[PDB]
Design a protein around this ligand. Structure first.
Ligand SMILES: Nc1ncnc2c1ncn2[C@@H]1O[C@H](COP(=O)(O)OP(=O)(O)O)[C@@H](O)[C@H]1O
Ligand SMILES: Nc1ncnc2c1ncn2[C@@H]1O[C@H](COP(=O)(O)OP(=O)(O)O)[C@@H](O)[C@H]1O
Ligand SMILES: Nc1ncnc2c1ncn2[C@@H]1O[C@H](COP(=O)(O)OP(=O)(O)O)[C@@H](O)[C@H]1O
Ligand SMILES: Nc1ncnc2c1ncn2[C@@H]1O[C@H](COP(=O)(O)OP(=O)(O)O)[C@@H](O)[C@H]1O
Ligand SMILES: [Mg+2]
Ligand SMILES: [Mg+2]
Ligand SMILES: [Mg+2]
Ligand SMILES: [Mg+2]
Lengths: 49, 412, 422, 435, 65, 65
């Protein structure tokens, strides 16, 4: 029966799977809140440049 | 737990400097052997780093090839706490096609100084009981509570489908909800206050604030010549954080292995870079004697100009004796799980003294493989002789290249 | 039949069970000492214990260095990564020399990750605007709620009700592959292609094993192609270019891979980096290789060199035994390849003839061997196919001595041309 | 008659190698004169190329300047035909600001390997005899096609209706419909539009009615080089870089993926490899890094046949201080066969001058042929060739029919060769810069 | 300049809900209208780089920039 | 031009000048090797550093409601 399967069509025993990429999760990168507050100057120290 | 990413390298056996509380170096401790004076000096430098009060201190490790300079540096990295940054680069790595040499050295310096920021946040973690849209009911194994939902929190719970029976955690200040499964239910308090401590290098701050989504440049590279104004503004903001107490500065180490590959421009930059108050402790290694400085015709005691050599303290590494070489071979064998007979140890020590230490270290693995092939259990002299026959050292290879000089290309 | 390359005959090292080289086995002839040393090196690579161990194949040109390296590659198999490279390839115009070296070091570390792929497939019934879409298969019909990103992907595929779609929820990728064969008779002529209904379940989970290098993860995270968001999409428009991947990214990938190995959903397969013309590197590359080879992550690296005592590229007057500075020669094991005797040359020529499908008589073989005693082995081999062409033209099915003589008269060797020029 | 893009060039007289069935060169055939040994070797190399079984065979054409190395290369190219790719580059072309020298050599190698794809397509071909499209203000339609053998009425789907409307299909159009994708192509019209329609100012020729069945199973052959595949797969908008040349260093992983799938396509029936020729003229401009790459590159199974030419003797290899034959390292010289070209004689030079006169369409007297052959032997072959054209122009200026000796003497006096110009430069050396 | 910045919700409404993802900021202490004479030091290079490339533009080309 | 043997206080003297001037007066330090930018020509780096050393104190009354 197995040989008859193969004689009919190889996809009966070993089908061609669709090749696909691996997908990784994003590299989560922790940082402090202050890091984003850098370069933020008080509005009482910024002139109308 | 098989075939981890970290495998047995050249400096895997080194776990520290092997020093006492008086910085007296033990003859064999934490993988280190001999180099007593240089290990004591490395320990003094390590204490300097840990104190972190003085900025811009430079130390050069100098000696013959194989005298354990990179080993000393790796030991200092291992002994130094993982919290404190330790940037280790080769001297050829500053020749980037994406940034100038001075910019690469600047980034390396700023990668070696860390800003430690502590902040508290409130985290809610529990099991969902009932959700009405708004009202939210959460329970733990010890307590249950019902919360009145806001418009933004209702939107957050609507975007991420949350239903009864799910176990989720919510950041109270931001509403960040992540589902971790369905129901073990959390045991303790539903609402907890957690301090979190991040150490962010000055370079990470610079790049994060360089541009929109600038943190991507911390991973892929792509960081151009960061503007000097941004760096100055960040230096001032970091000083303000230190004054206000919002952050602490953790000075680290920049290690430039084989610094002799730097050019006169890089050395001139290093002359002034070590004079800033945010300069880290610089450690260098070089085997060059009096030799020409790259980019100039001038010869210098280490390929480093005497301007920079005047800004640094030099640590010399001696040759090893027979006992130290044998002990290093023993520690490498223990690291690689190789059992050798005493006569094999003597033969390998003789080979290491005669030809090279690295050659003996490589012959350790070669002899182990040859012994495994013959169904052996302990490496014998026959295996050391076999691997000595199969594999040549630089001296013997050179002698054979001289024997057949007519067959080689551009031989002189 | 596949095209015959210079190293096609090389099928392995031809070592016996006791690791000793047979005189003529697996395409290789002679070089017994060097084959045995490459045997011990193959065993080292298979052991997966040592990182960063380097070996240098040093010998005259034509003495088998590249053939030995490819024999090692064959003995390892297709499972073990093998990254052949040339030293002159490090002189990239896009990234620095050290980045090219590091990327090649990371290419040679493989990783087999078993990943669970969940696929939704079927014929679309409803596309109600989050979207509650429906899929129908040979078994039954299910209603599914999907992220708006999947809906935008469907619109990109321009999916209409009655079309057969393939949705990989892991990567958020949708492939519309046709309209259902049920509709294939409605119109006598339509522009679309019809495909049968899927026979399996609507939602299927399949476990697959993916082979990637660490370099693949590095480049994927450095230049992300999976953001499917406005800013990432705008970034994808930018001209692609190699970038100087930082050590932070490689450390993060190292941590992720360690977590995968701990979970058991991945296996790490250290392979080989082979640098053919190491003397083409400069002193900067050698200085970087010092640190690189000492790393606990580095693969087994194989070097080839045919230079004598020549000048190191990038220096002024520093000469070294193979063009490699003495500091790097201390970190490598050296394998010496010896010149071939005329009998070994005759055996190699016969093997090359048998690989090229060429029949050669004993007298013609002896004349070709004599030609190889002068000139070089490569030249004597390279005369086989022209001489067989002349044989076929002359109506003979075997190379004779006259055809060898005629080809040697038509084509000159390097020494003969140098004598003519001088 | 009309001035085409291609004009009479320096090798326009070369039509091939001029060989017989036994690859024995003729004295004067296909524009080739002399070089019997070199042409026989080129014929053997061309057979080796056409067999395609051996990869990375390198041949160097070495000889004195003006001995016919580029001529032999062009003859090989002509006898190879357009089916087999033949990429000819100057050695100085690899020095690029867009890519490394090794990337340039890879793209040159991959450009010299064709991939001949085959696919079967369902093609409808017939005369539109009636088309009806009805739309609200879904669309419905009916199309009838004829092919002398049959007339079939089709009920049209919405997508086919949209395509037909976009193509503006009208009755009397001979169209082709690709059933695999619905692309509609118009071959031509079969008869005029109604004369009663104003504008429509055309009376184009009408193609003959199709024959046989309306729908046929047609096999189509598409050939692309490996470089085109690489550039297409390198990025989302790669195909635009095939023309602009804005190709960065294509990732080696993509090239390995392509090599693997191409191997599968040749294990399957989908594609056939057509390995061709890369001709690097003046190869001595390559530096040591390029030769060192060529050493490993020829060992690849996808490497083409590399042909090289150079006139340098034992000279310094570029980028080094070492002298080697041909300006090529001994390591690459070992990997190649050298073919040597010999200086011509009086008869060969005269025959070459005759062929050049024939291609330039210059009638010239036998005494003029003798004096020009003497000049060419004394000075150079190319100088005599250029005097052919100059003397033709001078003869036509004087309203003469045949270039005589007076015209050759005139143009010889007008235009100097390297030697007489050098002598006059030395006679006035103080006037030239930096002595 | 007429620029308006919404610096959070007033802390008097911190009890309007038990769980909202909002930033509460205290009510300002001084008067509604505040005057302050200020000084800022800039370099000419700062003006050069400010005018080197448009910033803050809502146009798509400015957003890409 | 401050001239003399290494370690004779040339940089110390320049920093003493900077201290005597004060924070308001700009003081741009640079090293000769910093002109070799890979993005802009050396003369551009020098012009940028020249412009950095010129300050401009801008005085304004902010009015905010
Ligand atoms: N004192 C020591 N104790 C233990 N191992 C050592 C010592 N010195 C050198 N080694 C080992 O010997 C080898 C060569 O030393 P290394 O530090 O690489 O020399 P170099 O200064 O030339 O870099 C390395 O494997 C190193 O770990
Ligand atoms: N021991 C050997 N047995 C069989 N074939 C060989 C042997 N050594 C070299 N060859 C073949 O002869 C040619 C010479 O290449 P190779 O000697 O590997 O170049 P190199 O070693 O100088 O890089 C190649 O076709 C190679 O496959
Ligand atoms: N055997 C030949 N038959 C016909 N024309 C030739 C022959 N040899 C040279 N020529 C012509 O003479 C000129 C010589 O230039 P070329 O063939 O490029 O010489 P080289 O490449 O050796 O410098 C060209 O116009 C060439 O077409
Ligand atoms: N005149 C001085 N008074 C006090 N300390 C000085 C003086 N000159 C130099 N120093 C100290 O010695 C160090 C070396 O002087 P430095 O200014 O670096 O000389 P140069 O810049 O000429 O190399 C300075 O960093 C400072 O710590
Ligand atoms: Mg070291
Ligand atoms: Mg080689
Ligand atoms: Mg030419
Ligand atoms: Mg100073």
């Amino acid at each position: 029966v197995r040989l008859q399967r193969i004689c009919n069509h190889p996809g009966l025993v070993e089908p061609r799977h669709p090749g696909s990429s691996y997908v990784a999760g994003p590299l989560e990168y922790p940082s402090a809140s202050l890091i984003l507050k850098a370069l933020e100057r008080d509005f009482w120290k910024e002139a109308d440049l | 737990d098989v075939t981890r990413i970290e495998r047995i390298g050249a400096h895997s056996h080194i776990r520290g400097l092997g020093l006492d509380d008086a910085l007296e170096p033990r003859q064999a401790s934490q993988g280190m052997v001999g180099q007593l004076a240089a290990r004591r000096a490395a320990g003094v430098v390590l204490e300097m780093i840990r104190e972190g009060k003085i900025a811009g201190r430079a130390v050069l490790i100098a000696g013959q090839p194989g005298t354990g300079k990179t080993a000393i540096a790796m030991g200092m990295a291992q002994a130094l706490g993982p919290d404190t940054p330790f940037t280790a680069i080769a001297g050829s790595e500053i020749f980037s096609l994406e940034m100038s040499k001075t910019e690469a050295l600047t980034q390396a310096f700023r990668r070696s100084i860390g800003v430690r920021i502590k902040e508290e946040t409130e985290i809610i973690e529990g099991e969902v009981v009932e959700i009405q849209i708004g009202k939210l009911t959460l329970k733990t194994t010890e307590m249950e509570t019902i919360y009145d939902l806001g418009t933004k929190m209702i939107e957050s719970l609507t975007k991420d489908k949350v239903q009864a029976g799910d176990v989720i955690t919510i950041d109270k200040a931001t509403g960040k909800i992540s589902k971790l499964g369905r129901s073990q239910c959390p045991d303790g308090e539903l609402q907890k206050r957690k301090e979190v401590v991040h150490t962010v290098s000055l370079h990470e701050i610079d790049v994060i604030n360089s541009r929109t989504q600038g943190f991507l440049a911390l991973f892929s590279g792509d960081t151009g010549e960061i503007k000097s104004e941004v760096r100055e503004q960040i230096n001032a903001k970091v000083a303000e954080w230190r004054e206000e107490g919002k952050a602490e500065i953790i000075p680290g180490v920049l290690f430039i292995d084989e610094v002799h590959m730097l050019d006169i421009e890089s050395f001139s930059f290093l002359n002034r870079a070590l004079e800033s108050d945010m300069a880290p402790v610089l450690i260098m290694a070089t085997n060059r004697g009096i030799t020409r400085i790259r980019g100039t015709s001038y010869q210098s005691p280490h390929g480093i100009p005497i301007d920079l050599l005047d800004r640094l303290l030099i640590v010399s590494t001696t040759p090893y004796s027979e006992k130290d070489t044998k002990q290093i071979l023993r520690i490498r064998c223990e690291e690689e799980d190789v059992e050798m007979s005493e006569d094999a140890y003597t033969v390998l020590t003789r080979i290491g003294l005669e030809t090279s230490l690295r050659y003996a270290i490589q012959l350790i693995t070669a002899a182990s493989l040859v012994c495994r092939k013959r169904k052996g259990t302990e490496v014998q002299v026959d295996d050391i002789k076999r691997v000595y026959s199969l594999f040549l050292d630089e001296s013997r290879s050179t002698q054979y290249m001289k024997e057949y000089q007519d067959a080689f290309l551009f031989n002189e | 039949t596949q095209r015959i390359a210079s190293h096609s005959h090389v099928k392995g090292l031809g070592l016996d069970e006791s690791g000793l080289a047979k005189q003529a086995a697996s395409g290789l002839v002679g070089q017994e000492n060097a084959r045995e040393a490459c045997g011990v090196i193959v065993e080292l690579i298979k052991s997966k214990k040592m990182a960063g161990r380097a070996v240098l194949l040093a010998g005259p040109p034509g003495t088998g260095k590249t053939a030995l390296a490819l024999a090692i590659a064959q003995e390892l198999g297709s499972k073990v990564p093998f990254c052949p490279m040339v030293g002159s390839e490090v002189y990239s115009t896009e990234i620095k020399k050290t980045e090219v070296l590091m990327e090649n070091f990371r290419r040679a570390i493989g990783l087999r990750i078993k990943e669970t792929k969940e696929v939704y497939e079927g014929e679309v019934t409803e596309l109600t605007p989050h979207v509650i879409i429906g899929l129908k298969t040979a078994k039954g019909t299910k209603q599914l709620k999907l992220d708006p990103s999947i809906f935008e992907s469907l619109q990109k595929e321009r999916v209409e009700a009655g079309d057969v779609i393939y949705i990989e929820a892991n990567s958020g990728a949708v492939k519309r592959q046709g309209r259902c064969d049920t509709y294939a008779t409605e119109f006598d002529l339509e522009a679309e292609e019809y495909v049968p209904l899927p026979k399996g379940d609507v939602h299927k989970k399949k476990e697959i094993i993916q082979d990637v290098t660490l370099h693949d993860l590095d480049v994927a995270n450095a230049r992300p192609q999976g953001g499917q968001d406005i800013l990432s999409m705008m970034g994808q428009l930018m001209k692609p270019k190699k970038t100087e991947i930082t050590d932070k990214l490689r450390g993060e990938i190292n941590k992720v891979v360690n977590k995968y190995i701990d979970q058991g959903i991945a296996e790490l397969v250290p392979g080989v980096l082979f640098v053919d013309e190491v003397h083409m590197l400069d002193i900067e590359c050698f200085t970087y290789l010092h640190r690189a080879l000492e790393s606990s992550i580095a693969p087994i690296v194989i070097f080839a060199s045919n230079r004598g005592n020549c000048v190191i590229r990038g220096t002024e007057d520093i000469t070294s035994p193979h063009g490699i500075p003495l500091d790097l020669l201390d970190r490598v094991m050296i394998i010496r390849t010896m010149l071939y005797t005329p009998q070994e040359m005759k055996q190699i020529i016969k093997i090359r003839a048998q690989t090229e499908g060429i029949n050669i008589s004993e007298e013609a073989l002896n004349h070709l061997g004599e030609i190889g005693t002068k000139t070089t082995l490569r030249y004597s081999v390279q005369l086989l196919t022209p001489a067989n062409l002349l044989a076929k033209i002359n109506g003979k099915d075997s190379i004779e001595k006259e055809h060898v003589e005629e080809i040697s008269e038509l084509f000159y060797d390097a020494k003969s041309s140098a004598k003519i020029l001088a």
